[PDB]
Design a protein around this ligand. Structure first.
Ligand code: NA
Ligand code: NA
Length: 581
């Protein structure tokens, strides 16, 4: 127990945290199940367990996805310190600030590694000053400002407290971890209490629960009572108890409090479930969950062009592909609707849904999707919507316009923190519904220089007024067939077009953006003293999947194939659109 060290690791993508975890594992003589010697997946295991002398160090990877601040909090709630790894030349970079801020907010003391100290142009002393300023900028406590520094060269396999007189090996980094990281604070003799912090899956056993055992012990085939954060309970039987050794999970006959473990055979475990000894059912506090706040309908493509471009089109081919994603994509949610050729798919931001669709197009799928929107849930008698905690890290020159746009998106400002080094951090509380479409506008407005983070917060009363109302109406084909130059030449005078001469269109397909706010049903199949000389079309607007989804309204769909992106009305005929209004 007193010999366990549970630490999380933080590093910019190119600052060699994988290289460092590898050197620490090799020099510790921990049995290595893989087969790499010296290089010259390059990402970490979610947990790496190092055996050094009579000490066990669990290194938990810090999630790098910007919309999963929930998961970052769960990592910090499970560990007792953080290892911040920083390059000897770049110094700390703004990409790791969000996760560093979470570590300090959960009251963790940091251990700083300045690695690549022998690379050309290294300036470790300057990196120390940069790290000190960051922590002060993060409102560090006096205990958080009193932190060890270990200089390191994974290349030469050496570490030290002093970069000018480095030791023969990595001994100093290990010693810094056991000296300054407290052992887990846990009750070994009380009844089993273990919270699910992370979920994983493999075809050999199914759902895998990952967590730090808060109290007691757990064995294979043990009878447990699982309790969720809604207080509902269910009895179950532990299948396998898996301990961590290097990059691998080990079938173990027991596991004790303080230890970070994988558990199986407990069916559909959810984040924050507490596995309990059946006599003493005690739920631990609810953990932040990465709630799927944006939803789209994934429908069978019913267009007159259906089946002509992709191999996979049926309702079961699509459902089979979705359930197949669901097991490997634990944040995602697939639901059946009253329509059997329509499936409500929910995920962490529209990007999560758009990536899935792009995967299915490449595979040969064909489908229609509705716009990304939130699910309005009735809780405590009223209609509430999801709200998010949002962090924006921007160059100071972008502060003005970023704030105006977030205000317009119903964003409540909560904090402004400039670093005095050309960047500012803005914390907002905004309904998820006001965040849809923003990441794209945010990149354009900040010229790709900004960083945006998201952590699900809560449901609350609906904030009044619609967000991102499209101002322009659309041009809708009233026929099926080949679009012609002479007719497109006349319509491009009334709006911008999505296609040119020779495109096959169908009735209700959207073929352009109208200059005015109203929709027009137009003819693009036949052509209507002086005249207009030359029939030349301005190049069509060819939208990405992301643009089609941010373009479409509630009465429209994006028809998707492996080779094509089409926009369409739900009601393909003008008569049908009139009978809805
Ligand atoms: Na739960
Ligand atoms: Na969201």
């Amino acid at each position: 127990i007193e010999n366990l060290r549970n630490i999380a690791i933080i590093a910019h993508v190119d600052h060699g945290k994988t290289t460092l975890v590898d050197k620490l594992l090799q020099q510790s003589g921990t049995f290595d199940a893989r087969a790499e010697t010296q290089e010259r997946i390059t990402i970490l295991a979610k947990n790496t367990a190092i055996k050094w002398n009579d000490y066990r160090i669990n290194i938990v990877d810090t999630p790098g996805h910007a919309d999963f601040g929930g998961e970052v909090e769960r990592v910090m709630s499970m560990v007792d310190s953080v290892l911040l790894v920083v390059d000897a030349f770049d110094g700390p970079m703004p990409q790791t600030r969000f996760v560093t801020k979470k570590a300090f907010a959960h009251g963790l003391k940091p251990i700083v590694v300045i690695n690549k100290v022998d690379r050309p142009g290294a300036r470790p002393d300057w990196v120390v000053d940069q790290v000190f300023d960051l922590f002060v900028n993060l409102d560090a406590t006096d205990e958080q400002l009193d932190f060890p520094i270990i200089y390191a060269s994974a290349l030469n396999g050496i570490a030290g407290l002093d970069h000018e007189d480095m030791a023969e090996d990595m001994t100093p980094l290990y010693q810094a971890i056991v000296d300054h990281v407290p052992a887990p604070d846990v009750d070994l003799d009380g009844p089993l209490q273990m919270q699910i912090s992370q979920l994983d899956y493999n075809n050999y056993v199914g759902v895998i629960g990952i967590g730090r055992i808060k109290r007691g012990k757990v064995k294979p085939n043990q009878q447990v009572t699982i309790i969720d954060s809604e207080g509902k309970t269910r009895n179950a039987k532990v299948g396998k108890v898996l301990t961590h050794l290097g990059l691998e999970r080990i079938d173990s006959n027991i596991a004790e409090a303080g230890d970070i473990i994988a558990i199986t055979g407990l069916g559909e475990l959810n984040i924050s479930d507490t596995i309990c000894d059946p006599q003493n059912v005690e739920a631990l506090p609810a953990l932040s969950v990465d709630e799927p706040t944006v939803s789209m309908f994934f429908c069978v493509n019913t267009s007159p062009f259906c089946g002509k471009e992709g191999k996979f089109v049926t309702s079961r081919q699509i459902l089979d592909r979705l359930n197949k994603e669901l097991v490997h994509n634990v944040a995602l949610r697939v639901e059946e609707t009253e329509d059997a050729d329509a499936f409500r798919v929910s995920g962490r931001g529209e990007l999560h849904l758009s990536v899935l669709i792009e995967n299915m197009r490449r595979e040969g799928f064909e489908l229609a999707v509705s716009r990304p929107k939130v699910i309005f849930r009735e809780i405590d008698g009223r209609k509430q919507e999801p709200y998010e905690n949002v962090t924006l890290d921007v160059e100071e020159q972008h502060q003005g316009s970023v704030m105006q746009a977030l205000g317009e998106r119903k964003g409540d400002l909560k904090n402004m923190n400039p670093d005095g080094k050309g960047r500012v951090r803005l914390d907002y509380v905004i309904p998820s519904r006001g965040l849809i479409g923003f990441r794209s506008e945010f990149m354009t407005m900040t010229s790709g220089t900004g960083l945006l983070y998201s952590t699900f917060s809560h449901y609350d009363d609906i904030r009044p007024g619609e967000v991102g109302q499209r101002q322009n109406g659309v041009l809708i084909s009233n026929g099926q067939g080949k679009a012609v130059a002479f007719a497109l030449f006349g319509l491009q005078d009334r709006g911008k077009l999505f296609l040119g001469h020779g495109a096959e269109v169908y009735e209700g397909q959207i073929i352009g953006i109208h200059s005015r706010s109203n929709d027009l049903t137009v003819n693009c199949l036949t052509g209507k003293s002086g005249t207009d000389e030359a029939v030349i079309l301005v190049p069509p607007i060819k939208m990405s999947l992301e643009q089609a989804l941010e373009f479409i309204d509630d009465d429209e769909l994006v028809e998707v194939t492996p080779t094509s992106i089409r926009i369409r009305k739900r009601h393909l005929t003008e008569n049908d659109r009139r009978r809805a209004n």
